[PDB]
Amino acid sequence: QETQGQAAARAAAADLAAGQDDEPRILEAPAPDARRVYVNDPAHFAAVTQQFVIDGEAGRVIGMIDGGFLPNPVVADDGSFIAHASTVFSRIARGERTDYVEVFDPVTLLPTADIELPDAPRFLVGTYPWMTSLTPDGKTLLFYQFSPAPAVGVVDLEGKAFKRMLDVPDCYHIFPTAPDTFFMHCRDGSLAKVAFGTEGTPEITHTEVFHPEDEFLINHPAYSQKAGRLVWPTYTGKIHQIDLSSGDAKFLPAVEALTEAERADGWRPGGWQQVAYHRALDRIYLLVDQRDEWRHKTASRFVVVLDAKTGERLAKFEMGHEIDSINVSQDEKPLLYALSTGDKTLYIHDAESGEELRSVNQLGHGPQVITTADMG
Amino acid sequence: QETQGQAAARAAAADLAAGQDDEPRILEAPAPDARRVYVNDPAHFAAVTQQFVIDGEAGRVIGMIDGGFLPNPVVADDGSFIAHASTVFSRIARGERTDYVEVFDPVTLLPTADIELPDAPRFLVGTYPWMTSLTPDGKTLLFYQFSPAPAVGVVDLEGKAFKRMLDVPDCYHIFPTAPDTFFMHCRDGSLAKVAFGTEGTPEITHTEVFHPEDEFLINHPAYSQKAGRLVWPTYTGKIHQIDLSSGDAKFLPAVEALTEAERADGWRPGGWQQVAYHRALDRIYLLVDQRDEWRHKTASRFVVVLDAKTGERLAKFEMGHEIDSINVSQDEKPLLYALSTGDKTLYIHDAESGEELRSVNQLGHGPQVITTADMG
Amino acid sequence: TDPRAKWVPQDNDIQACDYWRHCSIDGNICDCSGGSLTNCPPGTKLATASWVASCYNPTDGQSYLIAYRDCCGYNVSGRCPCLNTEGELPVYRPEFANDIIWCFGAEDDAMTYHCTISPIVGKA
Amino acid sequence: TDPRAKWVPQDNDIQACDYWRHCSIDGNICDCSGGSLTNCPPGTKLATASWVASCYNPTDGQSYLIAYRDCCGYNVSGRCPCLNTEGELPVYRPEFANDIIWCFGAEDDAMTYHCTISPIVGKASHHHHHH
Amino acid sequence: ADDALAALGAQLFVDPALSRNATQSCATCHDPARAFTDPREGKAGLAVSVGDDGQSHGDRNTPTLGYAALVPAFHRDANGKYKGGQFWDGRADDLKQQAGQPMLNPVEMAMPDRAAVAARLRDDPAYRTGFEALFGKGVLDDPERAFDAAAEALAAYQATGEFSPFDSKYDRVMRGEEKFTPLEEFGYTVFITENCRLCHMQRKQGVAERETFTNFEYHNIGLPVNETAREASGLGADHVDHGLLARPGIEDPAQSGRFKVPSLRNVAVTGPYMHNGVFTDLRTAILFYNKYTSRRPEAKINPETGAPWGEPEVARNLSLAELQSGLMLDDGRVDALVAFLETLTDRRYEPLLEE
Amino acid sequence: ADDALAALGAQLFVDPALSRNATQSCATCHDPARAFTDPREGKAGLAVSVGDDGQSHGDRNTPTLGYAALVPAFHRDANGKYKGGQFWDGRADDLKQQAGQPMLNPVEMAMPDRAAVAARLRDDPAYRTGFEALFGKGVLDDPERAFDAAAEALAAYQATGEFSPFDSKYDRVMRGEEKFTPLEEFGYTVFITENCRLCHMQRKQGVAERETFTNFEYHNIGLPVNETAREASGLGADHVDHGLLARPGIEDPAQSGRFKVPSLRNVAVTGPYMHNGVFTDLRTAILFYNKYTSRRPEAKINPETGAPWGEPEVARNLSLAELQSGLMLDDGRVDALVAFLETLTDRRYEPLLE
């Protein structure tokens, strides 16, 4: 019930009364752990941006990382590093463009690598987590390029060097399954498996087509790399699941997040990061609300929780705020993270009861993306 | 009563209905005139900032210019160009620092010069207009340096090159009075005249001390280069006026913007740009309110207007908003500009009646500085 | 004002988020930073690529193809932000996707987003 | 909330703009971006330069010298902004002036402003500003 | 009278008597069975047409006459863009000024002079009656009046519905009578979102009444010489076709290498393509644009030859602003654009798409 | 008792029988009339002191003993910084371990050994009484016990109020008995806002109970050799004073050239300045720091000589983070710092201030 500012006033007054000395210095963040969460603020397309590093258990900002124009954040699942792909210009938002990847130490937040990406190759888009992706060994970062045509850049994080671009078909997003392989989603309704080397045409194999041309699959699917589970909602809350854990795509039965009566009464998912997935519990969380069909990027005030195997609904939480984005911590008794772009506030909820526990406000100008590590 | 957005909907619908074609293109801003006004947003110390170019007559944003960290804007009085001294870093707010001057065409807003300033020499401070100043011929830009000591940098706008730093005494601000001369205000209470050649120690002469040690002169005096009139309020609203038009300082009789009875009742100036000066009318405008003596940077809700020659009060306006900065157009029937940092809004008033005519909102994150050209 | 309600176009004010041609705009209306409905502000660069939507015009009962264009090479204007997504499809149907910074082709390789213009290019 | 009223210090919450040591802060409180009352957040650089104010502590009735320090090399935090000006003097008395970015002496020549810390260095009163 | 002028033009259009050796009419090179273009094979394939002497080749590809009546008369607009006119270089102001040129051209119909053309008209009792009814008695006795009247009649016939029927699948879809396939609709969406519509739509904005997929402007898209056509024409290895600059009265060197944007209507059936017939296939004409946008090696190679596209005949004044669009056309989008451009084919030429 | 032990130390302190030829006592070099420093002019001015033999000069300047009792025993703190001890290089752990060293140093009091010291102690009936009362019968017959006891009394005498009275103007102002002048107050504010307080203040934050204007750490501020003092010391032109690295048991190369931060109390009356007495005027010692900050050509010049300050004697481990502060002291700030430092003069030395 005592706030963090009140606790600190008490502590500082006791040190003053006791005559305690301490040296002003640069703090280290606490060690990365399951309840650390990162919030990125694309700032409604501003030329510079910010990421907030947060202790979810305390509801406290423990660090920040500056970024350039629409950067893509990634967080190693084991907690060993974080990194982003970013873009800057010689005079704020014009002149010469430099695209680069920086890797950071997760406790000092100092850059430990700054790697230039030649010929300005990043795709500049409102932030989609799976447009830049670590392989599961953490040694390689893969990023999407849209112009002049779809391609995938390969960055060697261990050797701190850009490696190559790969040409790909008309496909989007990058879900890595092995040191040398990832999947993309194709315009034709298939996934493409891409297996690449340092040089040479990559081996690209399409899966079966798995959805019709008029089912629209959102820009923010959840992907659990450690489970190889791709959880892909459509505009109506139908959920496609793809099991990539064998190294090939296996199509799981589709589930409906909303009932037929709810859909008839206008319930649809909506927001930005509309879906989360908890690996250990095998559970799916989806941001939903009553809305017109083309209001699919507006906030939502409800989260439905369902069993990924059977599709059975476990809960429907009333969030009590306008929520654009959700994610969960990957530990036992996980937290449900609920970010409001409009309130610039992260609301931290108990993922089992749905109760709001605490919140962190003043998170930049238009915070949109929540990332956690799967450390377990 | 028809808004600009309404008039523009009607014109667009008529073009459509008539089949009038028009080519999408980059517009030119209207010619600079007496009623153009520039609003600088330092954005509460953000690493990147914006300037808004506004037509004060229509109450319309006619253009923008991007800047770096705490830039200093200047506007040529004859309307031929605008410029700023700005500061960028190679990784947003960290890495190699570059300070530079850009000069812009006032109708295309395109940079016509980009002049690097060696060894990152700018003084980084909350924005004071007279910390970066043009000479009256418009051919030289002078900027203040605080570290390692007070100094003034000379930038040749005609040859597009930094020239040199001038060593000065313990003095602040820069009021140019000729192609080769400017005045500064010294810690000891005198003004210093600095006369500078193409080479040498400058010739530096002091006036006698014109204010005592316990009389505090604000960071934002009004200076009319065309009048050679420096108008410098103290924290109590006592107004020092210095005539620089003969090329030497002559100190005018001090005037009090507030009466003794008002001062006893807590009236004091307060805000950022607290004082404006209209040359043709020889009139002084001062933002004031009832305030504790150490709330001198808070908004004020009143403007007092007084005759600069006699010190008689001509008017006292209730502004009707929390105002931080004022300035006026330099034409007849001048506008009084009243900028609210908190509202991010420029309120545009008739300077004679004090009545609000129109406003321009959404001006950045914490806009603070108004600049007008004196084109008469 | 209910953000989840069906969007209702008007043809009376171009600076409002419900103006009919802004049915799939994502960003800022150029008219509010010194451009006009179909012209960029001074100092920006006009992209040559576009994004399309079919926008109903309540003035004449007709749907028109709006081929939006970004004005680029400036930090985001911050004035008259709007986000509408009528007909808007995911990134793999990019001709209708509006999170992409469509600054491709702008002079001087400009790729930062300032604001968007809303010119008509045909009937639906 | 009257912004023009005499400022009233408290000793119960360091994240609030009326906390007693913040009597001449200008920027953002470091404790709100991963620092603490007297420490910089990770990744930032602590300046050696400082600004002073005599800040009255309502708890013990003494006035302390707070020699503020900037944490530099990051964009402004945006969390817990505050501007107080108790005893604050114009730029030509720079020891007491708070619009200056006091990032001098920061490692790596960091000069951008992120947030400010509020340590005590001593007791005392100033001629221009004594309780 | 409107009918009568155009019916007189109909007879002239197919009359070989307007050629020196009486072997060639307008319809020889502008064959109505081929969307008013030339099916005959010459020394350069179909790239250029053979004249009435059976030997002389032109140096430009014979364009369709379909929809040519929608083009404005030649003028400089307020932005200083030239627009409108006839021939690939706009050197004729309008259809009437163009009509007499093939007749007197020694590499086409090759009549010696106006008097010889009038003497041919006079020989024919049907022309005496038809001309005199519209233009007055004695018209065929005055070479200048007779030549001017014949051009008038020809221009009037090309302004009829027969030349500009607006019955392509595209027109039917726009009238709500049918729907595009997903592939056609995709190609339409590509056409409008990529750079194509910056030159191949009538208007910069708003809605055209009678779209013909050209803005009537002059652009240099940087095409190479067609070597076999240029050898056939006999103009010489050192010749340069300066496009618009060659129009008498244009002196602006910025107009060098600029050619009038063709209407894309019937493009599917009027190969080969560009002002010199340099590309055989419609796909190749589309892939040419990727040379400005793609970095792939394939983008620099003409798929018909396996060789580089070639150095521009005029390597200055390229429309780089429009051409350097930042986005290349992948194969699925080239497929879509071919499908869409096939929808611009008039109904009566749909049978031609098979081949 | 503690009183008695110090009273014994008071006797020893002024006793020249502790020197080989009986020509000098502690008080000779640490003169109480000069804040316990050496007024005598030798071959290098007042830079270094002459020993009992009348010819030998040291290589370092004699420090004040005022306030030396506030320095903690030598140790290495949790951040790996050495702090405390005695001598400019910290080679003695505390005042007790220091006191015996001038006695036996051939360039100072020059006694041949502890036994010679004991013998001189035994010769004095007042010492037999005084030492025996505190340490037990026969103390003076045992050279080790005698010498160790003499050092204990001397350390006790130095820890009395007479060495550390806290009666300077600065002290009176902090007790609220009087006010700084405007210049002195400016000077104090300069000292706190500029780099000086990074090294010359007991604590990092909070309020010190008995401030002595040092943090007790070791720094290399890049001082040049004092040429005439080095010549007078006889250590040779090839000698390098390695400061703290010279303490036995210190091996870490990063301590080379570092010296103990001196207390600034009575600084106005204890010139010349620095470990080697190189600067005679307090204003010159202050101006020295401008060499790391100012870009004016005069910053490179020692005003006392009109020539460049000179290369550092040890050109590594300079405390650049603290020294390169980005801010020059202009003349007005240098005047204000002098005025402030003069307020740190003990009450009994205020008459020396002129």
Ligand code: HEC
């Ligand atoms: C082959 C020997 C031809 C005969 C017989 C005629 N035309 Fe033609 N036509 C020909 C070429 C090679 C060209 C382009 C030449 C160039 O310099 O650009 C043309 C062009 C026209 C045009 C212009 C169409 C456009 O620019 O879009 C028109 C209106 C035209 N031709 C009409 C026309 C008439 C009426 C004819 C009989 C009098 C005639 N042409 C004969 C090839 C040949």
Ligand code: HEC
């Ligand atoms: C202006 C800069 C243009 C853009 C952008 C595109 N086109 Fe174009 N096209 C243009 C010109 C000036 C010409 C004639 C060039 C010459 O000198 O011959 C063309 C020609 C075509 C053709 C051939 C038509 C014919 O020969 O009758 C086709 C099929 C064509 N253009 C298609 C096309 C497409 C699909 C585009 C977007 C990729 C495109 N053009 C862009 C002018 C310009």
Ligand code: HEC
């Ligand atoms: C001149 C010949 C001296 C006599 C006699 C004594 N001292 Fe001294 N003292 C002298 C010097 C040159 C130095 C510094 C030498 C060095 O290597 O650093 C000292 C130092 C001390 C200190 C240390 C103070 C400090 O580091 O701040 C103490 C406590 C001290 N001296 C005490 C002392 C006593 C008790 C003496 C009589 C036995 C004595 N000194 C004699 C110069 C000379």
Ligand code: HEC
């Ligand atoms: C740590 C890096 C320091 C900073 C910053 C300042 N001083 Fe200092 N001071 C320091 C040391 C380690 C020493 C002795 C150096 C040596 O080897 O001899 C000093 C010395 C002084 C002196 C001379 C005192 C005396 O000899 O008794 C004075 C007057 C002095 N220092 C003052 C001073 C001022 C005013 C400063 C801010 C401008 C300052 N110092 C900075 C350690 C450090």
Ligand SMILES: [Ca+2]
């Ligand atoms: Ca053709």
Ligand SMILES: [Ca+2]
């Ligand atoms: Ca000394």
Ligand code: NA
């Ligand atoms: Na050929």
Ligand code: NA
């Ligand atoms: Na010509």
Ligand code: NA
């Ligand atoms: Na000397």
Ligand code: NA
């Ligand atoms: Na040693």
